[PDB]
């Protein structure tokens, strides 16, 4: 189905982004979705950012933290990391409670090799503090088309349930990547 | 419909082409279609080009010449010629009989202004002879979004019916034109 380019002034060119939705400002989040596993429970909506007309954010409700950090996630699959390419990972996240969020890009399936993960450190969210992250890394492993960009929220990362975690302005940029185009008329 | 880019080593860049189908090599022709008018009858199909593995071409069967040159046509609509732009018209045409083909890019409706038309001359097709045309013209009239690239085959142009006219490698290139792109997700 048909995806939506954005022309955000604070992100790199959409055409070189491996992600298909970055700003949620149309109320749409696809291909971003949630996962429940091992007892986790969650919901999602795209919602207005208070004080910032026009601006909307992806909002995950953590309902049950389940049995593991990976019991609750928000993710974007369909990611190939290319040997030799240098990626810029970018995102704004916040929460209405004190919680942790483990961000990673890595294999969807076993053995779940992690290609990026903020050097094994989750991010500490604090109410009233938004975190805008920007990091680079270079894929030194063989090219891997089975990757996802995922945030784990469950288990010992979780605050008291239920609560909200927000994502916005999310980008995985590669200067040597261009999305496949299709042409339409019109 | 979604359109399929080609990367012909003989045509200019697909993204700069006002035409959505140029090589026919997949078995598909859309938006190239036929028209029958004032007595004309015809058919079409995409068929293999004998002796040239993997090459296909649009084939028009002229069934009945009708009353006018315009009674039988093969044509691509959805063409905006823009004032001051310079357009390269390209095409390869041939037939199993001696006939004439009138090629033009002009208005779809009354008054049928013709912006390019090989200086009012139809092309003379002879069996065993393929014609590859390449001409430039600049659009000196005001931009007109009601144009088509049409080939007339009826009336006094026509050979003894039925017979086939073939079209291949068609392109209408403008260096200052870029097709709009949609993004689709693999
Ligand atoms: Ca937003
Ligand atoms: Ca062909």
Swiss-Prot record, chains A, B:
Keyword Hydrolase: yes
Keywords, comma-separated and alphabetical: Carbohydrate metabolism, Cellulose degradation, Glycosidase, Hydrolase, Polysaccharide degradation, Secreted, Signal
KW Zinc (keyword) present: no
Subcellular localization(s) per the UniProt record: Secreted
Family from the record: Belongs to the glycosyl hydrolase 9 (cellulase E) family.
CBM-cenC domain: residues covered: 16-175
GO molecular function: cellulase activity; cellulose 1,4-beta-cellobiosidase activity
Coiled coil: none
Gene Ontology CC terms: extracellular space
Broad class of the protein's primary localization: secreted
GO biological process entries: cellulose catabolic process; polysaccharide catabolic process
Name recorded for this polypeptide: Cellulose 1,4-beta-cellobiosidase
